[PDB]
Design a protein around this ligand. Structure first.
Ligand SMILES: NC(=O)C1=CN([C@@H]2O[C@H](COP(=O)(O)OP(=O)(O)OC[C@H]3O[C@@H](n4cnc5c(N)ncnc54)[C@H](O)[C@@H]3O)[C@@H](O)[C@H]2O)CC=C1
Ligand SMILES: NC(=O)C1=CN([C@@H]2O[C@H](COP(=O)(O)OP(=O)(O)OC[C@H]3O[C@@H](n4cnc5c(N)ncnc54)[C@H](O)[C@@H]3O)[C@@H](O)[C@H]2O)CC=C1
Ligand SMILES: NC(=O)C1=CN([C@@H]2O[C@H](COP(=O)(O)OP(=O)(O)OC[C@H]3O[C@@H](n4cnc5c(N)ncnc54)[C@H](O)[C@@H]3O)[C@@H](O)[C@H]2O)CC=C1
Ligand SMILES: NC(=O)C1=CN([C@@H]2O[C@H](COP(=O)(O)OP(=O)(O)OC[C@H]3O[C@@H](n4cnc5c(N)ncnc54)[C@H](O)[C@@H]3O)[C@@H](O)[C@H]2O)CC=C1
Ligand SMILES: O=P(O)(O)OC[C@H]1O[C@](O)(COP(=O)(O)O)[C@@H](O)[C@@H]1O
Ligand SMILES: O=P(O)(O)OC[C@H]1O[C@](O)(COP(=O)(O)O)[C@@H](O)[C@@H]1O
Ligand SMILES: [Ca+2]
Ligand SMILES: [Ca+2]
Lengths: 314, 314, 314, 314
């Protein structure tokens, strides 16, 4: 028998609503979308606005107001609820209030009988991913965070604009914390099959331009927050892509919040951090391990140690 | 010689930003999108947030922050600028305020050298379409408004849920003013090829339920605004579909703001009103005419009389 | 838990391979496509040629060379095996040959343990749908034939070309036997919301032109076969759309081979004939019933009698 | 302002017909498709079969039978005409006859007033691309051949199946002549960011397995021809993607038939060979140059020397 695939969204603010809109437009078999928000009226209005556009979609989809009960037979639970950062605030300044919000959300979600896959976007996303795994008691491979997918998308856009080359051919990652301590894989970067070192040697880009691009990646959230209050379009597309990759069993490699336990030298273990992993219908299929340059490995270790600090204080 | 297709968006609020997002996701050959707003910080932030997600799109697209000089070589100009209605404000006061804003907008656009197609969504949409045509001097067929496309989408969603049939197969229109004096084409409505009269005969639905549906359509915007502050997702998809129909030269029939001068009895002439028209690459190719029932014609003439009353004043 | 949707294709000729190609390009979550043919070299070559293009697809898909063992857990079985016709599709000789082929195919499929949905395209498609239902003993709502979907596609193309209007807005059907006894629903046809009778009265089309268009629909297959040897592109798309509507649970109304039992004047009963029905994840959800004009009802009854007599002689 | 993008297809065999089909299904705005074949009946039949499925397509498209006269205002001309291999023949046996055919076709097209972009697929594709350039006297950037895009697609499918990873993450090329002298960029290959050398070290792939995969790439065409008479699905998708990337001004890097005059050492110059280049609205924006291993450079220079040996004999 054929099945009805169900996604429950928890948190109907800018990020969640953008994700839901994008998913209705570009849908890899999501038959039911259930929206949950502690602000009941916001969720109701978003459900209405999404349903009023069905005539313009490629496919019809069931979009419903829901409660935690709906998670019982959900295949995916997307969590975007929590406080976002205000001007002058880091993502780590949200750890305490957002962890308390996630203790409550994860209890309800677990008590309903949910046994699908978690997709976490709330900040700080790596620590919130670890918290989801611990509170839920779920296997490590059924808990996914968006990690550095958004930072990587920003990096690839900036490089695409610099070289006037489609983002599809920009093979570079942001790894580490989804935050101030991230780093770019400059030494492993290629444009199609042409290494970045050849572009540097040819004077088509400079090392300080690389430093500036990485700093723009790091500061992008702060800039967009100053300009329009919060970021939601790019993260909405990233979540949509993760969801479709899961439902489609696409076995695609993405730089997500991945649980490391021996990879990248093993100096730091048992944390979630921005790193490449294979995604499929069962969740994470494998957390990859590849050699990165010594300086880049020191940056990775420093970022992972920063994360481990917060994990140890709880 | 292949060309670069350029769309300029004026007004980066909820409607305009939602349209731009939807267009980048489902893009029928827009190479360059230019976003303009009197609040330039908002426009900058939306440009950045839209660009940061390029890695997740099917196609790359140039999204830019611009000025009115960018309209010179634009192919389409989408206008979503102006005020949305507030409590205690009739359609007359918004007509006044928004026509005064459009004078400035259209003056700058036309002075830039623009000679493309106008797509208008600011409310009251039919009157603002008339105003755009009068201020711009453009041929009537080069000025399009969204008309009752959103009301028709709401109607077809309601009917699809009632009969549990895909919106694709709900053949019914909302016509007249985009507002309180609109009406449904009940007597000409079909579900696939089965007339609504048959469903009525079989107790599949009742006249009361039909009145209920029409009033749901009339009050949808008020409900959504109560619940979440504004509507923008469904209107964004509608505008995206219009723009793609134009660039794709699809010759598709839609219930837009159409210029009547003889159709539907011809008792009211020389106004834009929600009615079916064929849309193609050069704009409106034909405003159609078909027989509606006498009671529905009474409703149509009343709505057109209302719109003509507001126009003649100025 | 999430599942892998499995489609088995029996018959890897022009029609089957066209359908498989179109499905790989436009895929509503088919995870596994299995191809079977009594000519195993042909099935293998098609599997290889379809897999060699995965790089260019939106989504990866597992394309497999199969045996009947693969039907055990298949969700849909598409049958396009059988002799293609230079002369009459509904020859009693062709009926006999393809009935003998279907006996073997259905026996092997059913002995595999399959319990999904049959989608039949082999000719004569209405009688082959009947034979599939009889040999398999499946519920009638789990046996689908393509019926007059192809004839309706041709009709809507011809009308779209006549009026220079998108096929989207052409609301007309071909009904009755997929072949020489079919008829068009001229008296119920609409262009968008405009009845065809209004176009006739305005001189934009004539009765003779309607007759000629219907004869073009009837002679299309013969002409295409004369020119290029066989037809497979339009029918491949029709099969693809049926499959995607089923897996997407879209509740869409399609003119398929439907099991008639009282509808349309309850004269002929218990045969498969071209008629509109609601398609969903469950199979056929309902055969629709609406009033046709007396002349068209007579055409329909004559077509049904044609079919029943050919079933008798089998 | 907005235009109708016109593609003329010359050669309506399996390759051309598959490309046309795929294009109608996945269309980056091609408003008019014109089909030319010296066998007028085959072209007519293909036009009819393609048009009879418009109702199932996302967008309507104008498909017409035509003559050389129709290239006058064409934006793109795709050439798929000429002899195919058949069992026992290499692709280099066909040079003489196909060069004669191409002389005829190019002369007619150029005489028609066409000044757009050629896209060449007929075999041997590198030599036929060179011949198109020479006979047409067009700028080099106006002439595109499919080169090793098909070989690369086969390679990426084989590696995707071996590692069970999406083709999207397989970064490897086939370069050199589309034929028996090609080679794979093993030393520069990555699965996402993970070099192939690490998979070899970890025993997840072996040197003999790389040898075998390249041999499979080289013998794929012979095997598929033996099994079903000819290859056309994978090549059709490749052509479709080139066309959509041109019209979409996507600036994508593809391994196509590129004109070399200094790259990859100065050894062989002034020929077309399988190599990466940037494709955009104007044609070829830039032929890339990147370092490959010394043994692979030897292979590249031997392949190029063979192609030069053929070009000099004429
Ligand atoms: N790359 C990434 O992962 C990104 C992370 N982001 C974070 O995502 C989260 C949401 O951001 P925004 O949408 O802009 O914020 P928002 O102000 O729009 O609020 C999101 C929603 O969460 C709701 N909520 C709060 N508590 C609960 C609860 N217990 N159950 C259900 N709903 C609840 C709340 O009512 C609100 O509607 C923040 O933590 C952001 O920092 C935002 C941008 C990118
Ligand atoms: N056609 C339809 O069906 C509907 C029409 N809608 C109307 O669309 C318009 C925009 O709606 P929202 O996005 O929600 O409102 P909004 O406040 O969110 O955005 C309106 C934008 O217009 C900007 N603006 C104001 N004046 C000017 C100016 N002189 N020049 C340039 N920019 C200016 C302004 O800065 C703001 O960003 C309103 O008139 C709505 O009533 C909204 C909903 C549906
Ligand atoms: N429903 C519709 O609208 C249409 C129906 N069509 C019919 O579809 C069928 C196939 O058409 P084509 O592909 O062009 O013909 P084809 O000869 O190209 O393909 C038929 C395939 O079926 C194979 N086959 C034969 N017997 C068996 C068997 N016992 N088991 C498995 N495979 C077998 C056979 O080897 C061949 O590959 C014919 O009956 C057509 O008449 C064709 C056009 C439209
Ligand atoms: N990666 C690649 O580039 C590949 C190249 N391929 C080659 O593409 C070409 C076509 O392959 P197929 O479609 O299978 O062969 P086909 O015989 O099926 O079709 C070729 C068509 O070209 C027609 N034709 C011949 N001369 C002219 C002319 N002067 N004007 C117009 N039409 C003409 C001819 O009538 C025929 O219909 C062959 O040369 C193949 O070797 C096929 C596979 C892949
Ligand atoms: O022209 P309308 O009335 O707006 O309907 C358009 C819709 O009709 C359809 O063609 C379906 O029509 P049918 O139900 O008659 O088959 C859809 O594809 C299309 O979106
Ligand atoms: O594996 P990555 O680095 O995430 O890149 C994924 C992208 O690479 C591509 O496969 C293109 O690869 P190439 O540049 O090597 O041709 C895109 O299709 C895909 O979106
Ligand atoms: Ca740039
Ligand atoms: Ca015509």
């Amino acid at each position: 028998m054929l099945k009805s695939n169900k996604v429950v969204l928890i948190g109907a603010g800018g990020v969640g609503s953008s994700f839901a809109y994008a998913l209705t437009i570009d849908n890899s078999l999501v038959h039911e979308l259930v929206i949950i928000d502690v602000n009941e009226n916001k969720a109701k209005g978003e459900v209405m606005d999404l349903n009023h556009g069905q005539m313009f979609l490629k496919k019809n989809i069931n979009v419903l107001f829901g409660t935690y009960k709906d998670c019982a037979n959900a295949d995916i639970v997307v969590i975007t609820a929590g406080l976002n950062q205000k001007p002058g605030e880091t993502r780590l300044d949200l750890v305490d209030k957002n962890s308390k919000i996630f203790k409550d959300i994860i209890t309800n979600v677990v008590s309903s009988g949910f046994d699908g896959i978690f997709v976490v976007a709330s900040n700080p996303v790596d620590i919130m991913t670890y918290v989801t795994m611990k509170y839920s008691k779920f296997p490590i491979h059924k808990v996914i965070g968006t990690g550095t997918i958004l930072d990587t998308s920003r990096l690839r856009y900036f490089l695409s604009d610099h070289f006037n080359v489609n983002t599809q051919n920009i093979h570079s990652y942001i790894m580490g914390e989804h935050g101030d301590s991230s780093f770019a894989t400059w030494d492993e970067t290629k444009i199609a099959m042409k290494p970045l070192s050849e572009y540097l040697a040819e004077g088509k880009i400079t090392e300080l331009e690389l430093d500036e691009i990485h700093k723009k990646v790091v500061n992008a959230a702060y800039e967009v927050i100053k300009l329009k209050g919060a970021t939601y379009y790019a993260i909405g597309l990233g979540i949509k892509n993760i969801v479709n990759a899961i439902i489609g069993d696409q076995n695609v490699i993405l730089p997500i919040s991945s649980y490391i336990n021996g990879q990248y030298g093993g100096l730091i273990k048992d944390i979630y951090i921005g790193a490449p992993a294979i995604v499929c219908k069962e969740g994470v299929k494998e957390v990859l391990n590849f050699k990165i340059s010594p300086k880049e490995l020191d940056k990775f270790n420093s970022s992972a140690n920063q994360l481990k600090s917060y994990i140890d204080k709880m």
